[PDB]
Amino acid sequence: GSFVEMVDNLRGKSGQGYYVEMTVGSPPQTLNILVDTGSSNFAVGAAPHPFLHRYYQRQLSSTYRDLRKGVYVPYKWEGELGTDLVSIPHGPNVTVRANIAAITESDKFFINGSNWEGILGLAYAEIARPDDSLEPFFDSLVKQTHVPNLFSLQLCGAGFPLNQSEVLASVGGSMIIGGIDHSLYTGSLWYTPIRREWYYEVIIVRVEINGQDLKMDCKEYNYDKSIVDSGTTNLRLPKKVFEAAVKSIKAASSTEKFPDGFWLGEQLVCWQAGTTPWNIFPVISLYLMGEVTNQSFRITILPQQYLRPVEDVATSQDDCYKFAISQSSTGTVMGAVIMEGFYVVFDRARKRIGFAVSACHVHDEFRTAAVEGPFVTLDMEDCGYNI
Template identity: 35%
Template sequence: MFFKNNSEWQGLLGLAYTGISRPDKSVKSWIDAVMDANDQASLAFSLELCGMISNNNSNHIGNFDVILGNNERLNHTKFVANIIREWFYDITIFDITVDNQSLTTSSITCRDINNDKSIIDSGSTNLILPEKVYNSLTDALCKYVERNNISLNPDFWNTKDTSCFDFEQNWNILPNISISIARDANSYFILDLPGPSYVKQVFSDENSPLKYCYKVAIEKSTGNIGTILGAVTMEGFKVIFNRTSKTIEYQKGHCGPNVGLRGLYYDTNCDIIQKCSFKKLSTYDGNFFDRNILPIFFITVIIMVAAIVLVFLLKKGKENSWASHVFISMNRTPQLINED
C-alpha cells in the first residue's frame, strides 16, 4: 500500500500477489492481510470502474467490493479467464482486432502480444502493448480514419500529445478495439472497446481558447513489461478477481463506456494457452536464473560427464591407445566464440 505525501489519500492499494511485494516478499499485500484478518480461506474482490463523473468533473468514480467466503455474487459466468501465473494477474490474450481485422499476421503472433506477459492491472491507466503490436494497432487505426474520411491530425495517436478542439467530440466514430482472452485451452471470449474507451478527455489550461482536450489511452511498452490491460480497458465492466478459483470473471457493468462482451468462441485446432503464452519461469525473479545460471549449470554437467568417461577409459588397459586419443582431445583448451 503506497500513499504519496499530500496526495489526499490517493495511492496504490496492494491487490496483487505477495510475490511482487516491495521491498521484499515478506511484506504481506493488503488483500492477503484482509483475508488473514477475517480468517477466510475463500476470497475475491470486484472492481467496477466508471470513468470521469462528467465532462466538467475530472474525478473518477467506481465501486470496489471485497467478497469473503462462498458468495452468490460469484456467478461463474462463461466470461472467465484463468490466472496462469500468480504474481500480477497474468492471463493469456489470443488476439487483438481493430474493426474486426486481426493484428496477428505472419510477422506478429499471439505470443508477441503476450511477450513477456499479459496482465490485468487497475494500477495502470492505459492499454499498454509491446512495440510491434502497438505499431500495428496504431497503423490500423490510422488507416481506418483515412478510409472513413475522419478529420484527425496524424499526431493525434501520439500519446504524449494532447489534442484540443473547440467543441465536444464523439469518439464513437472510431472503430472497436477487440481483445480476445483465453478462457481455457480451446475457447475464448472477446472484450469490445469502443472509441470512448481509448480516447479520454483531459483538462487543458484554463487560459486555453480550446475547451475540449483529449489524449489517446494506448501506449507502447518500454523494456519487457509486455501487455497491460489498464483501467481504461476495465471501464464499463465489472471485473471479479477470484483468488480462490484463480480466475478473473467479466460481467457488463452499470456505468462507463458502452463496451461489449461476447463469446464463447472455440478453436479446436490448437491449445490456445500453450500456443500464445510467452515462455516464462514460475517465479518472479526466475529470469536471472534462466539467463545466467542455466548455461553455467549445463556446461558444468557436460564437463563432469566427460571427466567420468575419461577416467573410465583410462582404466581400461585394453584400450590404451584410444583412451590416449580421447585424453589428448579432452585437454584441448576450450575456445569461446564471440557471436557479436
C-alpha cells in the same frame, strides 16, 4: 446488488487513479488509498509532502509496531516497514493487522490534486517489496477474517472532464471486497485463467480492430506478459503490437488526419462541443483464453474507453481527449481506461479473472462495449511467453 455497503465506495479518474477510503492506527487515521492491482505493497505517506494534506502519524497510533526494516521501491518512494490495525470504512466490517510501508521519501509518486495519500497493492506476494515474505494486505485480510478470497472492481470513467471539485463529489466506482455485486454489470461474466499468481497475468489469443484480425503471432500479444493493472492509466501494448495496432486504428479513422503527437499520447485533440466523431474510430477486441479447453471469449472496447477526456488547455467549451493507448517494453497492460469498460472480478480463490460489460461504461446510441463467447481457439497455451 448484494453488497450495498461497498457499492460506490471509489473516487477518482483514469488519469490519476481510483482510490478507496481506509483507516490506519488506533485511534483510526483516515487516508485515501489508490487501488492498484499492479503491485503488492500497502504503502502510505508518513511524512509531510507538498502534495499531501494528510499522512500516517505512527507516533499517534498505540497499535503501531516497528518492523525495523527499510524498503526502496523505484518505478519512486522509500519507506519504513511496520504493522498496524487497518479497516476499510465502506467495506467488510472487519479490522486486520497488516503490513504498512510508511513512506518517508518519494519522487514523482504523489500527484498534485489526485487526493490519495497511499497505495493498496492487491497483487500477489511474489512481487511484494523487499521480497515475498512481506504479506500483502489482501492475504492478511483473508487469513485473519472470514472474507472470501475474491474482490471485484467497477471503475467508472465519467466520459468527460471532472474539475477539482467535481472529482471529489463524484462517485468513481466500486470495489466489492469478498464478493460480486450483480447490479454493477449487464450480460454474463466470462472468466479467463490467471496464468501465474504474481501480477494478475492473463493470456490474449487474438486482437481485432473493427473486426479485422491484427494477424500477429499470438505470442507477440503477451510478450513478455499481459496483466490487468488498475494502477496504470493506459491500455499499453508491446512495441510491435502497438505499431501494428496504431497503423490499423489510423487506417480505420483515416477520414480525419491527426498529428503524430496525438498517436504518441502526448497531445490532445479537440472537437466542437458534442461533435466528437466517435463513429470514425474503430472498436478494439481482445480475445482471452477461456476456462474450457480450446475455448476463448472476447472483450470489446469503444473509443469512448481509449480516448481519455481531458480539459482543453483553454478551458473552452470544446470536447478534448488524449489517445490512451501507448507502447510498452514490459508486456501488455490493461490499465484503467480498459477497466472502465468492464466489471472485473479478481477470483483469487479460483485463480481466474472475470469480465462483464460495466453498468457504468461510457458509450453512444450506436455501439456498446461487449463481453462475448465462446469461440473455438486452438493452441492457446502457445500464446504465453516463456523467458
